Design an enzyme around this catalytic site. Sequence first.
Site, PDB file in Angstrom:
ATOM      1  N   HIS D 708      48.417  38.025  37.458  1.00 26.45           N
ATOM      2  CA  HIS D 708      48.087  36.669  37.022  1.00 26.45           C
ATOM      3  C   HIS D 708      48.029  35.545  38.059  1.00 26.45           C
ATOM      4  O   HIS D 708      48.053  34.366  37.701  1.00 26.45           O
ATOM      5  CB  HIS D 708      48.993  36.252  35.842  1.00 26.45           C
ATOM      6  CG  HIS D 708      48.705  36.994  34.564  1.00 26.45           C
ATOM      7  ND1 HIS D 708      49.256  38.225  34.279  1.00 26.45           N
ATOM      8  CD2 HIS D 708      47.915  36.683  33.510  1.00 26.45           C
ATOM      9  CE1 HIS D 708      48.819  38.636  33.104  1.00 26.45           C
ATOM     10  NE2 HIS D 708      48.003  37.720  32.615  1.00 26.45           N
ATOM     11  N   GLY D 878      40.845  42.010  27.240  1.00 30.30           N
ATOM     12  CA  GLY D 878      41.155  41.056  28.284  1.00 30.30           C
ATOM     13  C   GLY D 878      42.448  40.277  28.236  1.00 30.30           C
ATOM     14  O   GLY D 878      42.674  39.372  29.044  1.00 30.30           O
ATOM     15  N   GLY D 879      43.330  40.626  27.315  1.00 36.55           N
ATOM     16  CA  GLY D 879      44.580  39.891  27.223  1.00 36.55           C
ATOM     17  C   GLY D 879      44.410  38.533  26.543  1.00 36.55           C
ATOM     18  O   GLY D 879      43.320  38.151  26.105  1.00 36.55           O
ATOM     19  N   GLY D 880      45.515  37.802  26.457  1.00 36.13           N
ATOM     20  CA  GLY D 880      45.515  36.502  25.818  1.00 36.13           C
ATOM     21  C   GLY D 880      46.941  36.192  25.415  1.00 36.13           C
ATOM     22  O   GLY D 880      47.797  36.019  26.280  1.00 36.13           O
ATOM     23  N   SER D 927      47.289  42.671  30.397  1.00 39.26           N
ATOM     24  CA  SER D 927      48.022  41.487  29.947  1.00 39.26           C
ATOM     25  C   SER D 927      48.545  41.658  28.510  1.00 39.26           C
ATOM     26  O   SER D 927      49.280  42.611  28.187  1.00 39.26           O
ATOM     27  CB  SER D 927      47.118  40.282  29.999  1.00 39.26           C
ATOM     28  OG  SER D 927      47.059  39.827  31.326  1.00 39.26           O
ATOM     29  N   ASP D 928      48.180  40.727  27.637  1.00 38.83           N
ATOM     30  CA  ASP D 928      48.632  40.848  26.273  1.00 38.83           C
ATOM     31  C   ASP D 928      48.183  42.239  25.802  1.00 38.83           C
ATOM     32  O   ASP D 928      48.849  42.892  24.991  1.00 38.83           O
ATOM     33  CB  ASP D 928      48.039  39.739  25.410  1.00 38.83           C
ATOM     34  CG  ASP D 928      48.947  39.370  24.241  1.00 38.83           C
ATOM     35  OD1 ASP D 928      50.178  39.388  24.436  1.00 38.83           O
ATOM     36  OD2 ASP D 928      48.423  39.055  23.156  1.00 38.83           O
ATOM     37  N   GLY D 955      52.992  36.342  32.264  1.00 39.85           N
ATOM     38  CA  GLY D 955      52.127  35.240  31.862  1.00 39.85           C
ATOM     39  C   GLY D 955      52.124  33.956  32.680  1.00 39.85           C
ATOM     40  O   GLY D 955      52.998  33.719  33.512  1.00 39.85           O
ATOM     41  N   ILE D 956      51.140  33.109  32.401  1.00 38.64           N
ATOM     42  CA  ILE D 956      50.972  31.840  33.103  1.00 38.64           C
ATOM     43  C   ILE D 956      50.555  30.703  32.197  1.00 38.64           C
ATOM     44  O   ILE D 956      49.964  30.916  31.140  1.00 38.64           O
ATOM     45  CB  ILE D 956      49.865  31.940  34.157  1.00 38.64           C
ATOM     46  CG1 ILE D 956      48.531  32.106  33.415  1.00 38.64           C
ATOM     47  CG2 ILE D 956      50.147  33.096  35.113  1.00 38.64           C
ATOM     48  CD1 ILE D 956      47.351  32.345  34.283  1.00 38.64           C
ATOM     49  N   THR D 957      50.842  29.491  32.658  1.00 35.86           N
ATOM     50  CA  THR D 957      50.464  28.260  31.960  1.00 35.86           C
ATOM     51  C   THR D 957      50.295  27.162  33.012  1.00 35.86           C
ATOM     52  O   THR D 957      51.181  26.335  33.216  1.00 35.86           O
ATOM     53  CB  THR D 957      51.522  27.831  30.930  1.00 35.86           C
ATOM     54  OG1 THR D 957      51.665  28.860  29.936  1.00 35.86           O
ATOM     55  CG2 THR D 957      51.100  26.519  30.265  1.00 35.86           C
TER      56      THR D 957
HETATM   57  C1  LIG Z   1      50.616  26.129  25.621  1.00 34.91           C
HETATM   58  C2  LIG Z   1      51.432  25.242  26.577  1.00 34.91           C
HETATM   59  C3  LIG Z   1      50.307  24.274  27.031  1.00 34.91           C
HETATM   60  C4  LIG Z   1      50.457  23.726  28.463  1.00 34.91           C
HETATM   61  C5  LIG Z   1      49.075  23.305  29.001  1.00 34.91           C
HETATM   62  C6  LIG Z   1      49.229  22.746  30.428  1.00 34.91           C
HETATM   63  C7  LIG Z   1      50.564  21.989  30.542  1.00 34.91           C
HETATM   64  C8  LIG Z   1      50.291  20.508  30.867  1.00 34.91           C
HETATM   65  C9  LIG Z   1      51.584  19.848  31.385  1.00 34.91           C
HETATM   66  C10 LIG Z   1      51.378  18.325  31.488  1.00 34.91           C
END
Ligand SMILES: CCCCCCCCCC
Lengths: 107, 107, 214, 1023, 107, 70, 4, 4
Positions: D708, D878-880, D927-928, D955-957
């Site tokens: 990721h 592809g995950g998710g 991934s998922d 995972g990532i965000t």
């Molecule tokens: C699902 C969690 C959503 C986070 C999107 C990006 C975070 C923005 C932080 C200001």
Amino acid sequence: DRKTVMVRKDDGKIYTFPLEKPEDERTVETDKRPLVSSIHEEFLQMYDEAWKLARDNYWNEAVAKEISERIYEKYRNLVPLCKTRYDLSNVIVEMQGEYRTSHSYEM
Amino acid sequence: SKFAEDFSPLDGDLIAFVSRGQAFIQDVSGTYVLKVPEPLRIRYVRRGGDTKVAFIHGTREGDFLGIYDYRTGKAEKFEENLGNVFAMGVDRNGKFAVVANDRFEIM
Amino acid sequence: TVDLETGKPTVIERSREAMITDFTISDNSRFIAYGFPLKHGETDGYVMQAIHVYDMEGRKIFAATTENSHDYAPAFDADSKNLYYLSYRSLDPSPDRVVLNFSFEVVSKPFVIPLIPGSPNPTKLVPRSMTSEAGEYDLNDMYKRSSPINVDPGDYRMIIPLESSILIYSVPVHGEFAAYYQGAPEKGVLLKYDVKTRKVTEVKNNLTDLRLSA
Amino acid sequence: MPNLLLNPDIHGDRIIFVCCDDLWEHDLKSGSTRKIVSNLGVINNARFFPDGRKIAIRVMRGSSLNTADLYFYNGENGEIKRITYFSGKSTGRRMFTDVAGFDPDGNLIISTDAMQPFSSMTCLYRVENDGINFVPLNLGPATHILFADGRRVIGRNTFELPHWKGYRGGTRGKIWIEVNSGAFKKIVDMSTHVSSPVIVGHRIYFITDIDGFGQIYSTDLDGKDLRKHTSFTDYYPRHLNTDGRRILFSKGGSIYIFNPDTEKIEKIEIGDLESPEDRIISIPSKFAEDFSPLDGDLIAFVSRGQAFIQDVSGTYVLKVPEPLRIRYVRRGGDTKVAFIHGTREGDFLGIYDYRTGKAEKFEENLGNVFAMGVDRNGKFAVVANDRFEIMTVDLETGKPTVIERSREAMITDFTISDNSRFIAYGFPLKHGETDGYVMQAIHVYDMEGRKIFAATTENSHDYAPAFDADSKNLYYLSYRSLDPSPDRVVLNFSFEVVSKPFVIPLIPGSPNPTKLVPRSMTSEAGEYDLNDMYKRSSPINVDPGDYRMIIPLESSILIYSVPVHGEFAAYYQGAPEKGVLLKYDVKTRKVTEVKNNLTDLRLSADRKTVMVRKDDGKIYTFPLEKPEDERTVETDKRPLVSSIHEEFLQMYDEAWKLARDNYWNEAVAKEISERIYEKYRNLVPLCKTRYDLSNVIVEMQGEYRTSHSYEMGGTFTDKDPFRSGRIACDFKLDGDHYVVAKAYAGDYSNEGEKSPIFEYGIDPTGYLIEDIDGETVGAGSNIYRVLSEKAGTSARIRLSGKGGDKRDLMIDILDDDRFIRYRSWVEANRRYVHERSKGTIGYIHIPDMGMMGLNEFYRLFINESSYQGLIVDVRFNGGGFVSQLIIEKLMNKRIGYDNPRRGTLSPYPTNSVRGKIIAITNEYAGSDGDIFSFSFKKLGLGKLIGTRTWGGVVGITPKRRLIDGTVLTQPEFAFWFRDAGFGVENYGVDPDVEIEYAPHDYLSGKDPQIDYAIDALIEELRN
Amino acid sequence: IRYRSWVEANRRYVHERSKGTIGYIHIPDMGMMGLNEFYRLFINESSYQGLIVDVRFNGGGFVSQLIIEKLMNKRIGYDNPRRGTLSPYPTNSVRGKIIAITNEYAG
Amino acid sequence: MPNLLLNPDIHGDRIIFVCCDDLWEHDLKSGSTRKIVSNLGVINNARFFPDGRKIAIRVMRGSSLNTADL
Amino acid sequence: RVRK
Amino acid sequence: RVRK
Ligand SMILES: CCCCCCCCCC
Ligand SMILES: CCCCCCCCCC
């Protein structure tokens, strides 16, 4: 039919509206489909036209019949070596100079 | 749009216009476009019937009158030279056309 | 179909899952389009619905739609040239604001089917000079010629084809508490779509039911 | 100042390679170098033809190099020519549509997915007539195709993986080989990834990092006799290429040579090549953000790391005099603005006065700031960091003071009372160190007495706090108005419109101002008392919906509403959400629309000026009193100016910091970061293009040896993306005419699932394409090109079928037909499973675990769930993140029925699978997809058939991007399976039964995976 | 208001008596309200060592299958973040032991 | 298909000239040629400095080459 | 949202 | 809807 009006405004765009309801105008779009062409086919076309106008518009018809007929082929053989509009310019300008007169410009 | 010119309104709310020497029959939107099937240098395009348009095709030899039907496809191009055309129009009943050349003639 | 003269009812088709209450008759009295509830198994968890069209001449049933979802509200145009209907096929999940879950909220969209092969989607505004309609009725594999009409997905309950516009009955998303306990009627709004301008507008709101003349 | 050389190819003395996105040629003999091709966009691969005369080049276009196609180069006449018009989709990690190799006859073999349903199906194709026709090799997906002794050598997933060093998952590069003019055998399948294979003599040389680092190895044409040749330690070697004699490759930005015989490694000398203008000009709108309204009708906004004070017009512009990386700009006075400046060390508060000039910048570190605000009296500021703290910074001294720290998420939603006394904010909380949801309660902090109070209870989500002008009542929104909305497809209910506004008077005894309680009948004018204020809370009579902001005004209240809508576009295209500004008149209790098509809104401190962005991307501004009078905020008047080398360094350090700060394991982070910093920083100065930087950055991200770590977005070129005209069909050159080899279609009645030709009631399959828009296509006319030139429009196509059948229709030339091909595939497999199981087995396929997955699963789940058996094909997934939701569905067991007086049985539950289930999975599901696979087995829902999966469950965000828009990702959420730990990461999932899909299986046109699955279920269905 | 009062009372009661180790949820019926009440507390009580799903006086409806499907979820993993707390997988999974209460007024 | 070469400058064995709006260099000795500069717009004049090391170039821009700079 |  |  005098029912449809087509116009261009100071913004360069083209519009169209019914004469009965001039408030209902739409914008005529044309940049949806790309325009397609061939450089070597266009360059030849453009050379011949430049060569023809130069001949057809020279002030002296006599001098025209001679200069034209004597410079045509000579400069036409360079067109196929041209790859850019600037290359074409070089060929065309040199052939325009063959009239040895003022005001033979290219803008 | 960068090389467009001679924009003209047709029947069925269609449009005709010339660009970079090519001609087209399209809707205001520019989504449905048809190119006139003719070699380089279309000087003018003019409504000549429900689905028929008259055009002026130019070559090294001169300018010639033509006709195209964007519905069927028939595009019989004439050969009678008209000299250097600068104005062209067609009657409302597609019988004949009026042309002006650089010989100062109207025909 | 019951002969309004003699009185002789004639069964056209019988579903084995639910009633066939959603139907329409073409203006020329030749076709009968209706929702036909079906299942692909004597124990399926869901019941599909495919629009069926019945021809009074030749007396034969045709499949206007496939049997993979819910297609309804069939309706013919005045000239009886194309059949319009709605369907919940425009799947797209909507997020739940409380519980980690997703639901199909606005997946409704209108479609059309020209009864004459070769003829395009009337709403596509395809120049007449560039088409060659005027063929002849042919309802075979018409579900293949189906086409949608460019209108944002939502929750539609009726579609009415008009001369140069189409009326659509929309039902904004809402809770179901009141409807479940108080039997409270659902709130809709009559919308208008202009084929030319492709713009939508509101004709009437606060509607809880609508009927339209013949 | 040398360049960054890379991806070379060799042929005799000549050596082509990439520098500055352009292609260069070097002659060892003379020692000279020259650029042989340029201005085509970004080039990453160049391959020598057999004769060594022509060269096949892969070039990318599009702001983010999201598109790509192949070109030819004739070194004889210097001719250049585009070969493919597929507009193949590519990303940094999967740069598909490239040169696979060359067949014995000297023809080019390409690898592309342009005509496939899944991107990973990078099937092999032979190029004919310079892109006129394409003949499939039906060998399945491949990245390389070599030949030796009349034997096909296939390299699967053998491209380089700089972003993931030490990758040992199921998608690891492997090599197969022909043995019986049609039979294939896997010969190189090490534990790690194998990339860039070449054959010198009778040995295949490739690269792998099984020893802990990238090196070159080789083995006979039987995968036997392994040998380790190089012993590098500085940078991994990449892009192996040969001519039959010596091998060529790149490392740390230089081009090297390896002689198989001598076994000697030598560096080629090239020196400086190109040093473009360092000072670049950019368009502010293209990188703008944080637009904010100031006093005197001024505007403040940030772009490409710079800040500006300008008028709506954009004619009078002032840049804030501060070095790179201004994260935020906020009104802090009549002519003073407060800002947040970021550096490699962290984020710091600053202040600037665009009138005088005084710009005293603070030094007290604030960590990673994500929200900043200033009171209306420019005394202090409120800041939120990634430490989950909310604090007040003295705008005079600079002393930050932490008010409260959440332990769940950041406190970015806050507001300050107009009198600067209270601070209301959303405080994310949990009632357990493992709760599934995070609640949010509004908290109010009093500057006097310095104490926190609970404005709301902790049972749901309360937000958007806001005080009224006089600072007498606190307004806010909450998702507490529960009321279910029915799902129109699947038996389910969701909370769609459960948002509603509430108010809390800061003075006990005072009623709800919106209740219009006659003053003569009340006795307000008490005194501030925030104790148990959550008890005095009251709602405001406004229909439930989806509100994002509430603004209390004199005799009205503004509310930002967001009509329910799907999330597909938002999930894949990042498409902004659409809202509308509503007004509620307290007196009339009637609502109205103030402004629509809004995608974002900001409001002045004086509540008199409104700034918003509409769905057209533009920014507008209008007075709240006269919302009809809006102007457009222009910013592209003044060119944005910067330095490539200053920005590149800035960008590297940030990418390096985020990677460190967001890695799931803090420990591993401190070590990896500190150990890779300098090593990769020394390459930045060699970079001249965004692509050069990408190479350095990605390689450094790979140093975390985790999944990721991606790099998306960013501006790599001014070239427009490649176009590809599609009509959901497959063409074949037969004689002098193109024939419709195939006409894809899935669900005829669905939307966008078939060749647009079908609308004219005719299956194009078999017909001959005469001409398109007048131009004749065929033997001497590339249909692919013609279609490309009509993409996105409607063209007249003349066709011809059996007999004198001739059609002339106006077809919609689509820009893409992937989905139509995907749906076609799914429906084909679905039809297949029915016929083979004699109508006793269902089929469902899940493309990914995102919105689309959710779509496809339910699209068929409702017709296939009631068969004796079910096949849940999740190959290529592809995950998710929605795997858990799909499992929960399949988890249902049928335990009853409903017997009706009329009709058929109703299974209970409805969403219950009737019988036996079986899952299919390959290495292209991760991934998922990884999580789903392990879970399916773990819960015993059925058997798993296929091949080991990808193996990237961290995972990532992303929540922060680079100044050029680049969005980098960092493995931040390590998945821990009970009784297995993090085992899944860097490994994948093992199917109960392994069913390979060899190249010979593709040649026979059989799917051994789906067949086994079907045949296996029939066996279980004998009971 | 009296129903919610009762539920909250029972909820506070269950916490104090189980020394904060048990959750509480009550389902009034299997209609829209049930769905409302179940999720209203399901999101705060599902992650305790134990859970009590009080369904006494349940007036019936049809959404029972949906609520069961929820409780049917078993926690088999977690998400470890760089900052923050663990995320149970599935999210709608009950953390531990469950126990149901029912009387003759639930049908 | 040869090009249209023009406006050259000489210095020793090296010879710079214009082809396809771009600037090229040719070495009489080796007989090889290469493009030393491109994508700047239309170039019509290139001049060798005294040392023969640097080169002054005049390039035109604008749809009709109505503007120029060195 | 914890994409994977 | 099969209420119970
Ligand atoms: C699902 C969690 C959503 C986070 C999107 C990006 C975070 C923005 C932080 C200001
Ligand atoms: C015309 C029949 C009306 C049936 C009453 C409601 C049935 C809904 C099934 C949930």
